[PDB]
PDB file of C-alpha atoms and ligand atoms in Angstrom:
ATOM      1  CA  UNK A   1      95.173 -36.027  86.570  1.00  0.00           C
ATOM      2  CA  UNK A   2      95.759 -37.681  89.902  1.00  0.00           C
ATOM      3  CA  UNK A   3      92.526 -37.598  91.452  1.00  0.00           C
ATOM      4  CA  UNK A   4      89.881 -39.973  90.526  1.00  0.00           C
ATOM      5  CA  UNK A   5      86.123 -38.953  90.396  1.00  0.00           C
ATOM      6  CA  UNK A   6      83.611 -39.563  89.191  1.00  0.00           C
ATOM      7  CA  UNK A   7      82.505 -36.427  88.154  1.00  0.00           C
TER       8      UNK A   7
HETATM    9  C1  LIG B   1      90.356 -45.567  88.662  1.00  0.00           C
HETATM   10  O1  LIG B   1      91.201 -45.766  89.738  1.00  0.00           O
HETATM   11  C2  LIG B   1      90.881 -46.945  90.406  1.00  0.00           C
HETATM   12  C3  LIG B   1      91.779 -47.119  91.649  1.00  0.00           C
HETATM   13  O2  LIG B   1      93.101 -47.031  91.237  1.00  0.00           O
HETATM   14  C4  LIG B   1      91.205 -48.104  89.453  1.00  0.00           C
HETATM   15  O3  LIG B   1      90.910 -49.240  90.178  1.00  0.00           O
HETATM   16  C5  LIG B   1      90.215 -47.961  88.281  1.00  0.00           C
HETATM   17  O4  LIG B   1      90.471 -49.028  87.435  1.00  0.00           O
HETATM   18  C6  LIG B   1      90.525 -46.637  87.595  1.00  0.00           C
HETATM   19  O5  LIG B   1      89.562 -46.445  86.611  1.00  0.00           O
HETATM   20  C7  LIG B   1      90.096 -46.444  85.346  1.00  0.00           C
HETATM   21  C8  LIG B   1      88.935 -46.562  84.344  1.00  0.00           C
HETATM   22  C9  LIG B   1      88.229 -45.213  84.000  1.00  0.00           C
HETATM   23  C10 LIG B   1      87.229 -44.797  85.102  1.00  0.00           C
HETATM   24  N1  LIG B   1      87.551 -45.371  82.727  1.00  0.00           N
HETATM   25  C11 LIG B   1      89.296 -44.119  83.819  1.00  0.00           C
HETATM   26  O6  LIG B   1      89.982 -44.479  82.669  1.00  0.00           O
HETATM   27  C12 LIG B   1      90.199 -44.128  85.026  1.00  0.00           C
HETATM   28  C13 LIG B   1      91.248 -43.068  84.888  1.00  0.00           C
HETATM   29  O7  LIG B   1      90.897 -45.327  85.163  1.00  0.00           O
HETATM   30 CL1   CL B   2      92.109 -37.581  88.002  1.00  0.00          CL
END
């Protein structure tokens, strides 16, 4: 991924 969150 690469992003983070949290979803
Ligand atoms: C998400 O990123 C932050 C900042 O770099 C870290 O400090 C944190 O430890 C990291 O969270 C981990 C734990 C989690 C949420 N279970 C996932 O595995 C993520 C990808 O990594
Ligand atoms: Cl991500």
């Amino acid at each position: 991924x690469x992003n983070x969150x949290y979803x």
